[PDB]
């Protein structure tokens, strides 16, 4: 009944429509701050000298951008990895030219998103659940860390973190392929496998359960009203589903245990996305995709091109054009 | 890479709907597998929860009630209907692939979403006007001229060095 | 920006027509109960 104990009980209460928790105490302010800065910047920020060459790039709607082209531009290469809060600028005008909003947004989002993961652990503890939904979320959270933090650390500059917009995203992934040959990296290939695999298994599982709904309805009503929230009996027939999928392929390639099947659904996209987040994180230290440029030559020693060498011709066209005014010396070492 | 340099396929809203369906599927796949695995009933004594399922049991093996409360409070909304849930897992990735099929059909014909006209008019008239939209087309322009002769041998493209688009130093 | 003028009526109808259809069917659903 002491004033602190009562606060602690509200924070951790299972009765708030939205759970707060000790993690929620950091998350709420930092996400509200990143959110509000982002919304304002996207709409109204003036142009930003991302590449530190006094060539500002317009990112917001009021400066002639649409939903597809707008972005909060990353902070100036001139800043590199230096901290740049508002209070280090001589004025908001300076802070805006050099791209301060981006730093503010990413740090607060990374924090609140970290606490988001932990908040998932927390409520699971308070509800008597098993604990690992948060392990699943760490795959996307790790992805956000790689492109907003890890990649800039290893290249030495936040100007090279992922822009916060739709075309900026594509710009980031084009330059990435030119500099890292990421398609030829096995961890991106496992990401594609994680991600294609995930869509496949989602559709499979969704179609197998849907295929074996037990008749509880008429033709004139949704099959969905055959399930009632909290009913104890399962709402589909799992052995009829296993019966069909075993024969579509062969018996032993089909689950008859729903716990293994659902664990499989969780493991496949999580693991693959860990790897492809690791791929971005290790390419941050420039351990790049396989390089077979000129790996095939004839008896005389002519180059005999493969598809790798074609890939490289396109990587070259990305290379020579990106950040066209920003390089004074022949190699783009960062 | 061909479709990026020649079609600017990433800018096509039918591909974007494909992306949201594939990644949405993968999301749904992970999140539904992890929810079930962490809302399980305790039906066996041992620490491997797999043993405690029986394929023939009528009783559900995880709690839809504790799953629904969890996600309502973490995320604000949650599923309440198991049939809609699993039908939605069918719907999301199936539809996204269908939308991207349509887009590629457009590209059969070079009917690309390659440009935004308003942007080009301004940038032509205003050399201080730069966006990520204009930067990406420079890259597309790099790809086309550098890969085309080797990639389309039958066109006998000959591009002497002076005509190749290149930024400074590189 | 020099932008397609019918863009506005196109976007406004693209939203209003399907949205209104859904509202009509929701509200006559509540009145049944």
């Amino acid at each position: 009944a002491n004033l602190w104990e009562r606060f602690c009980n509200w924070v951790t209460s299972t009765d708030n429509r939205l759970y707060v928790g000790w993690f929620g105490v950091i998350m709420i302010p930092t996400l509200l701050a990143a959110t509000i800065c982002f919304v304002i910047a996207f709409i109204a920020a003036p142009p930003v000298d991302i590449d530190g060459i006094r060539e500002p790039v317009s990112g917001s709607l009021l400066y002639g951008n649409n939903i597809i082209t707008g972005a909060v531009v990353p902070s100036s290469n001139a800043i590199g990895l230096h901290f740049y809060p508002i209070w280090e600028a001589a004025s908001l005008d300076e802070w805006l030219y050099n791209g301060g909003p981006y730093q503010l947004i990413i740090f607060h989002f990374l924090l609140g998103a970290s606490c988001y993961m932990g908040r998932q652990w927390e409520l699971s503890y308070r509800l008597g659940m098993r604990p690992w939904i948060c392990v699943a979320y760490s795959a996307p959270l790790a992805s956000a860390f790689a492109v907003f933090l890890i990649y800039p650390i290893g290249q030495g500059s936040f100007s090279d973190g992922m822009p916060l917009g739709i075309s900026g995203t594509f710009n980031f992934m084009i330059v990435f392929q030119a500099e890292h040959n990421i398609l030829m990296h096995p961890f991106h290939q496992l990401g594609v496998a994680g991600v294609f695999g995930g869509a496949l298994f989602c559709a499979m599982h969704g179609s197998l359960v849907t295929s074996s709904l037990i008749r509880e309805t008429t033709e004139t009503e949704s099959a969905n009203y055959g399930y009632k929230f909290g009913q104890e009996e399962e709402t589909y027939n799992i052995v009829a589903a296993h019966g069909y999928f075993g024969r579509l392929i062969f018996q032993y390639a089909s689950f008859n245990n729903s716990r293994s099947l659902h664990f499989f659904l969780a493991a496949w996209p999580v693991v693959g996305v860990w790897f492809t987040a690791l791929g971005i994180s290790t390419m941050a230290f420039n351990l790049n995709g396989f390089n077979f440029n000129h790996s095939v030559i004839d008896a005389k020693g002519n180059v005999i091109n493969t598809w790798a060498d074609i890939i490289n011709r396109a990587n070259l066209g990305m290379e020579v054009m990106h950040e066209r005014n920003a390089h004074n010396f022949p190699l783009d070492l960062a | 890479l061909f479709f990026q340099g020649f079609h600017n396929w990433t800018l096509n809203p039918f591909h974007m709907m494909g992306v949201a369906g594939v990644l949405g599927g993968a999301l749904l796949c992970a999140i539904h597998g992890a929810t079930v695995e962490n809302t399980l009933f305790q039906d066996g004594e041992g620490a491997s929860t797999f043993r405690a399922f029986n394929p023939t049991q009528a009783e559900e093996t995880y709690s839809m009630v504790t799953a629904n409360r969890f996600w309502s409070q973490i995320f604000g909304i949650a599923f309440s209907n198991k049939r809609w849930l699993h039908f939605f897992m069918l719907f999301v990735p199936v539809t996204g692939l269908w939308m991207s099929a349509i887009g590629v059909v457009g590209l059969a014909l070079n009917l690309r979403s390659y440009d935004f006209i308003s942007q080009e008019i301004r940038a032509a008239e205003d050399p201080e006007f730069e966006t990520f939209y204009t930067k990406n087309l420079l890259l597309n322009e790099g790809i086309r001229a550098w890969m085309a002769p080797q990639d389309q041998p039958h066109e006998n493209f000959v591009f002497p060095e002076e005509v190749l688009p290149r930024g400074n130093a590189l | 920006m020099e932008v397609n003028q019918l863009g506005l009526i196109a976007t406004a109808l693209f939203v209003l027509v399907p949205s209104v259809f859904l509202i009509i069917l929701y509200v006559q659903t509540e009145s049944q109960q």
């Binding site: 709409i43 709607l61 649409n66 009632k228 929230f229 909290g230 | 909304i77 | 920006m1 932008v3 863009g7």
Partner: peptide, 30 residues
């Protein structure tokens, strides 16, 4: 007018969020 349109649609989405969460049909057991 493009800007006004973009931001009006965005703002409608945020309001839908509000009603989707706090004014949801409340799930009822069995």
């Amino acid at each position: 007018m493009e800007t006004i349109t973009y931001v009006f649609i965005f703002a409608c989405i945020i309001a839908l969020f509000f009603f989707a969460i706090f004014f949801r049909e409340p799930p009822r057991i069995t």
